[PDB]
Structure 1
């Protein structure tokens, strides 16, 4: 049985590399020391954003918004990536189509914030496929309320990154996130938990093998799932505010569908 799980772990890590251009291993390399060819351009203020805009997508107003539409572009691209990955999870495409949609609807942002921690450190976040690095302080100072988006993600990334996970661990765990039978509105819950049950078993074996001297990483990792949940709810509120105060900004149909009647 160990063998079957080991194979599933291998399978998932494989689809993970194929589905995501910027892995956590690559992100760490850039963030730390391969500083010569992989060194990012840093954006810490109003002006550097323009100086560096060569690789990116009332000054305050415009700026706070160029970043907004920028996160939106990347978001939709991330969704598309996560959707591609989901199809590789054994069993996922054989489920009721309606449920596939429902697992993605509530699963995608939870996955997005998890993997986004891979791109963050105490001081900031990699942007533009690793080529850029926007500082935490700059983001926290954008025109109000656009400055309240990122802090709670940074707060999580810092904690979650303390678990020292690598992509092979991440691949299984984000699959476990997706295959959650507790998502509101699912039709056939039993087929979904039968799969998740197998995924957790893979994650438990994987975690014991990769982090032997890390007592209850499996349990600690599972509890982090309450942190992501809280981050999307707080997030949704943030967006509802913006759609009223900024009636000129458009949401992308893909993100709009995800959010519509979510919780």
Structure 2
């Protein structure tokens, strides 16, 4: 029953993944191998005028400085990805079967881990794609921002480069992300056994998918479990840096949805 049942299960989640995420790793890698390079104030200014963003510039807070503007651009991209992760989750029948409060709990504590995991898809050692792959913001430019804003993004690059060395494709990622969302460990969950059961099914689907898709990649599955653990620490460290900013930079605002996610 299992292997055939789980291949169908995997196929469905892969389809949900393709349906709800505009930028695939496949699409991203092709571009990363002709986007407009953002590497300083002038080119970002030109990008804001030239490129097509999902969130219009006039919708963002009034311009103060480059570091804070980038910080707001990060929030915009995050909120957009959270929107897609929500529809991705809702496109998974077992997820949508959960009570709505549990759905919210899983998304609340899950999306940032998933975002940092998916972030690698549009990242190389030199920078990351923005504006639907129309732009490419350099890693050095992001390093050049003033404290505390420069230190937030660099750890995500470090994780991504190691993560991309595993060479997962979109079919692997769909299951990997699904396993991050449907996680029985989240605080305040109502029906833990049910979520743990779904999570187990996804992980069994993944281990079989990896054997079929990556037959010669030894220890690939336990390595990915470790990355799931690593992502929890990355998010923990991220939340601390975000907290530092709210305290020290009282002038800067936080998007209301993100306020709710960080409410604790």
The two structures have a TM-score, normalised by structure 1, of 0.93
In 2, the alpha carbon distance for the partners of 1:153 and 1:74 equals: 14
Q: CA deviation at 1:51?
A: 2.6
Query: How is 1:172-191 mapped onto 2 (pairs within 5 angstroms)?
Result: 172-191=175-194
Match of 1:36 in 2: none
1:31 aligns with 2:32: yes
Query: How is 1:184-199 mapped onto 2 (pairs within 5 angstroms)?
Result: 184-199=187-202
In 1, the alpha carbon distance for the partners of 2:231 and 2:156 equals: 9
| Structure 2 residue runs without a partner (length 5+) | 58-62
In 2, the alpha carbon distance for the partners of 1:52 and 1:105 equals: 32
Q: Please identify runs of 4+ aligned residues in structure 1 that moved more than 4 A.
A: none
| Structure 1 residue runs without a partner (length 5+) | 33-38
In 2, the alpha carbon distance for the partners of 1:90 and 1:168 equals: 18
* Alpha-carbon contact 1:61-1:143 (below 8 Å) kept: no
1:201 aligns with 2:214: no
In 2, the alpha carbon distance for the partners of 1:108 and 1:85 equals: 11
Query: How is 1:166-245 mapped onto 2 (pairs within 5 angstroms)?
Result: 166-245=169-248
Query: How is 1:70-89 mapped onto 2 (pairs within 5 angstroms)?
Result: 70-89=73-92
Match of 1:21 in 2: 22
Q: Deviations over 1:114-138 (max 9, x none)?
A: 0001010011111111111001111
In 2, the alpha carbon distance for the partners of 1:84 and 1:179 equals: 14
In 1, the alpha carbon distance for the partners of 2:182 and 2:140 equals: 35
Q: CA deviation at 1:249?
A: 1.6
Q: CA deviation at 1:168?
A: 0.4
Of residues 108, 111, 134, the one that matches 1:108 is 111
In 2, the alpha carbon distance for the partners of 1:82 and 1:140 equals: 28
In 2, the alpha carbon distance for the partners of 1:215 and 1:248 equals: 50
Match of 2:46 in 1: 51
* Alpha-carbon contact 1:122-1:158 (below 8 Å) kept: yes
Q: CA deviation at 1:90?
A: 2.8
* Alpha-carbon contact 1:78-1:112 (below 8 Å) kept: yes
What SS does the aligned partner of 2:32 have?
A: helix
Match of 2:152 in 1: 149
